Amino acid sequence: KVFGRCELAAAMKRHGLDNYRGYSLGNWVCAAKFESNFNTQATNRNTDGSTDYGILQINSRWWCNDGRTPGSRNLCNIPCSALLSSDITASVNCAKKIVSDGNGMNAWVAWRNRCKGTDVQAWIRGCRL
Ligand SMILES: [Cl-]
Ligand SMILES: [Cl-]
Ligand SMILES: [Cl-]
Ligand SMILES: [Cl-]
Ligand SMILES: [Cl-]
Ligand SMILES: [Cl-]
Ligand code: NA
Structure with missing residues (x-):
């Protein structure tokens, strides 16, 4: 989706x-x-x-199990495929866990390099919320 x-x-x-x-x-x-x-x-x-x-x-x-990452952990306790669903619940719950890990949203390199310190609110501008 x-x-x-x-x-x-x-x-x-x-x-x-x-x-x-x-x-x-x-x-x-x-x-x-x-x-x-x-x-x-x-x-x-x-x-x-x-x-x-x-x-x-x-x-x-660290976060999910795909059965093909030797030495990895599954801290969110889900198969990585659940992260691909049209339903974002699993991705959301797992993200809440990651962002609490100690380093905040820096855990996402694209957020650090492309969102951090930018006008992020542009991204929800005009959205009926
Ligand atoms: Cl699609
Ligand atoms: Cl694995
Ligand atoms: Cl933080
Ligand atoms: Cl991650
Ligand atoms: Cl915002
Ligand atoms: Cl939309
Ligand atoms: Na894993």
Whole structure:
């Protein structure tokens, strides 16, 4: 499922991401934007053998199980495929866990490089929320 911008904002908010751990909706949507282009089915293989999954490109090295990342953990306790669903609940819950890990949204390299310190609220501007 490729979400529209305001559609994803709405879904993220309904799942309590809005201002979760102090990050406004604009951050999460911006992050989704540059991480996956709003596509629940986005995957990317990393050089170390791990894989990024879903709308927030959650990584199998720590957070999910894809059965093909030797030495990895499954801290969100889900198969990585659940992160690819048209339903963002799993991605959202797992993201709440990541963003509490100690380093906030810096855990997403695209957020740090492309969203952090920008006018993130542009990302939810005009959305009926
Ligand atoms: Cl699609
Ligand atoms: Cl939309
Ligand atoms: Cl915002
Ligand atoms: Cl991650
Ligand atoms: Cl594995
Ligand atoms: Cl923080
Ligand atoms: Na894993």
